[PDB]
């Protein structure tokens, strides 16, 4: 049972992950989307910047 | 006794699978579905940075959002002015086999390393005008695949030893070591709060690392093969990953589930690099076919394509103010796209 | 008045570009060789007679060769091998006849050869310890490679006069097992250059120079190929 | 999570035979190559057999030719090894290793210490 | 009687061929190898022949009527002369680089650089402009060619009152045709020998076939250099020594044919040296 040295770590790590309080996807997904809409106006690769305001153009 | 431990592990794996299935009351695709598409996204090369004699392994944007540091096989780091195209510095390396690099957020120093198993820190604020190594971090035995800077003189590294570590660049010592991966660790991404880090590895998995505790909080699975790149979603609760199975995945840290996948029937190319735009709506990914694609991160469609590299894309980066995308490649040219 | 900063940046760029052009001239004149091979293959005797990556420098006929030797990231090994595709050659060292070390060497060889990022890299192949093979054979291949029972040397074989025929067929059998892999793919985009050696001299080892000459000549000819 | 589960091992007398197989799960592999890997007591890991994703056999180690054969069925996600008349030298742990990437020809290192666990495995004693 | 249609065709083909080579080698970049430094220089000297030789020489010779100022006469000839010397020397420089790259691989990597290729180009053009200097001698002669006692105003290069007409044409023969003819021939003969010894020894079907194609083109280049330029170098040296015999025979086998064959070297140079090259797919990238 020499390999038990690592089997024990697998069991302890899984036991800890098994205790995570998980959030439903419908809500988590909705929050992800809300971030994207809220900051869409601030993102130059999505909403292009006029040349006079663009350091690379 | 070994047999009992094996059984306990399998029972726990099922408890986790059921705990995750319990959250599957939606997919992102059923939440976003009535949202207007980003439409077609196009970019053009605005600047080309020439000077490397060999393929680029790594690139990183600074925080002033103007400078870039890039690393290549010919033995040098080059610090570039992204607006004027001029070289600011060129730094000779002791060993040319450099796989990674990073620019400190303060702008005071640069990290790099590779098959030498040493992370070397260069001091850019030099009184002589001569950039010199201030320190070398060694204790790793495998190659350095990735390094990222933290404030208060700390660097997070990952290697081919399957481990990651937090180093104090004052003494050249590790203070924290993160373990649990079985394959090489391919990438690091720091959370916006730089207290959580995510580590990707060649065992088709990713782990969320509690930095102060030195332990794994959560393990994410879903890929068929090795993960080559990870980036955090800008708002801290999701990370996008890319792998050798030629797909990207979006992971939900609160649900502990993959949330969405990005793929296409005509892509059999591995993904070498991923990054997000500021809103988190555009997911950029570099591929083995010398294209970079732009994905609509909420609808999982392809918003556009950045063509124009003659060899493998090795690295992507987006400047902090969102103004530009830099792409490094094996054709030795670094291009800036807008 | 910001123009003074622009002048300073241009002068800094000029010094940097001058140094890079000097380095370019050096880089193109220096050849890069990877030393790769099977465990217990005698990698060390090829380098002796000829912390990560070790480097040995050689000069032959005023040309400079840098060879990247052995250790570090040694066994895993699929992610770091890609760093060495931009080399003049891979020097692959296999000893000619525990486990089936030769079959392992053959699988490792194929893994170079058919790797999509190593598709353009030539391999110099040293079948080492030919004296080990000679003693084991005259005193072993067919235990692992039954095909050997029916093998005869080619009419193009050049055995050492006085050499035992059982050894000469053993040497050529092994060589051909590597070549049948090489001849199966590429269509001529990369080449294999096999040699039989031992830890005895540098006359056969110096063939690296001659193989590099052939490898580079073949590359140069690509610029003159027709549509 | 990718999984490969081996079954069918046990004790056979010299001259007898076994059918070993792995059930694959957590992936689409009709795009991937498969390998049988063997570990004798007291030894490291050796490669035994290689089948392409098309179902065509590619190769066998010389020591098993005419004795062992392999096949796969992409409809049921299964991999098989037919072990015919066996000798004491064939006593080993058998593993179902798989190649690291889809759509390729290269495949390594399926016999390494930390790779070759994929499909771990069953003991066959002759 | 329709030779004019042939002359305009050759002109257009030559101009487009060189215009595209000049454009692609600059427009596409991703090149600028020492090889491209020489090919670009060659395409440039070819346009100078293309755009001067036709309108100020080959056409006036058909008309026996040249309309020009004396400075037009004098300037145009030193140009055309320059272009002949330059394309000749650029072909020699190219053959020497091919020799180095193939017969001495590992060593050409040390001496062959852009700082070398540009010394050669500068020397070639600067030298040509100092050996064609006797062209500001060529002037306006007025033979009667028309029906109404009118003259042609033809230009001729005459060295006054001496045997120098012979020394000059003999000089250009040996230091522009015979020597570079031999140097290209030897540099290519040595490449062909080495590739040949290799192909016979080896006989990768793909490589054996590639080597045969390279050898065939080295032979074609030598043959066309000698075929295109010899007839004019010989025609000029001949008359230089025996004007009555030469002019009698050369108008019998018209000089216009000879002059047009050397003209076509400006058509062919870009095809052998650039358009048939595998890498001049980059031309597609640049214009499509
Ligand atoms: C060699 O290198 C150069 C050469 C010439 C040169 N030479 C000529 N020869 C006669 O024209 C002639 C010679 C001759 C001899 C005999 C026995 C009889 C007759 C009728 C003869 N003709 C016809 C005539 O004179 O009408 S044409 C010419 C223009 C140059 C171009 C070169 C490319 C191809 C087109 C021409 C030079 O421009 C002046 C500058 C240089 Cl560097």
Author numbering:
A (entry chain G): 6 to 62
B (entry chain B): 3 to 340
C (entry chain A): 11 to 60, 205 to 251, 262 to 303, 307 to 394
D (entry chain N): 1 to 126
E (entry chain R): 42 to 244, 301 to 385
Article, verbatim:
Cholecystokinin (CCK) receptor family belongs to class-A sevenfold transmembrane G protein-coupled receptors, and is divided into CCK1 receptor (CCK1R) and CCK2 receptor (CCK2R). Hence, CCK receptors (CCKRs) regulate a variety of physiological functions including digestion, satiety, emotion regulation, pain sensation, and memory process. CCK1R couples to Gs and Gq, whereas CCK2R primarily couples to Gq. Here we report the cryo-electron microscopy (cryo-EM) structures of CCK1R–Gs signaling complexes liganded either by sulfated cholecystokinin octapeptide (CCK-8) or a CCK1R-selective small-molecule SR146131, and CCK2R–Gq complexes stabilized by either sulfated CCK-8 or a CCK2R-selective ligand gastrin-17.
SR146131, developed by Sanofi-Synthelabo41, is a potent, orally active, and non-peptide agonist that selectively acts on CCK1R with a promising application as atypical antipsychotic drug. In the SR146131–CCK1R structure, TM2–TM4, TM6–TM7, and ECL2–ECL3 of CCK1R participate in the recognition of SR146131. SR146131 occupies a similar position to that of the Phe1Asp2Trp4 motif of CCK-8 (the superscript indicated the residue position from the C-terminus of the peptide), which are part of the minimal sequence required for the biological activity of CCK-8 and receptor activation. The head of SR146131 overlies the pocket formed by TM6–ECL3–TM7, and foot A (phenyl ring) stands on TM3–TM6, whereas foot B (cyclohexane ring) stands on TM2 and TM7. L992.62, M1213.32, and L3567.39 of CCK1R form a hydrophobic pocket for the cyclohexane ring of SR146131. The phenyl ring is stabilized by M1734.57, Y1794.63, and F3306.52. Both Y1794.63A and F3306.52A substitutions cannot be activated by SR146131 as measured by the cAMP accumulation assay. SR146131 activity was completely abolished by either N982.61T or L3567.39H mutation, attributed to the steric hindrance by L3567.39H and to the loss of polar interactions by N982.61T. In conclusion, structures of ligand-bound CCKRs reveal that N982.61, L3567.39, and Y3607.43 in CCK1R contribute to the subtype selectivity of CCKRs for SR146131. CCK1R TM6 locates between the positions of β2AR TM6 in the inactive and active states.
